[PDB]
Amino acid sequence: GLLSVSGNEDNQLTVKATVDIGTEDKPKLVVGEAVVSIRPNN
């Protein structure tokens, strides 16, 4: 989970994490998400 912002970045990032509780063609991906905003570095 170490998010690396590159620079030249202006888009509101949604950092997801899905957990496969399911199987092949029945994935049922349980996700919780974190909305990441961007502070520039001059």
Task: Please give the residue ranges that form the binding site for a copy of itself (CB under 8 A).
Answer: 10, 37-40, 42
Q: How far is the CB of 3 from a copy of itself (least distance, A)?
A: 15
Q: How far is the CB of 41 from a copy of itself (least distance, A)?
A: 9
Q: How far is the CB of 15 from a copy of itself (least distance, A)?
A: 16
Cβ closest to a copy of itself, residue 4 vs residue 42: 42
What is residue 41's three-state secondary structure?
coil
Question: Per residue in 6-38, is it b (16+ CB within 10 Å) or e — as a string?
Answer: eeeeeeeeeeeeeeeeeeeeeeeeeeeeeeeee
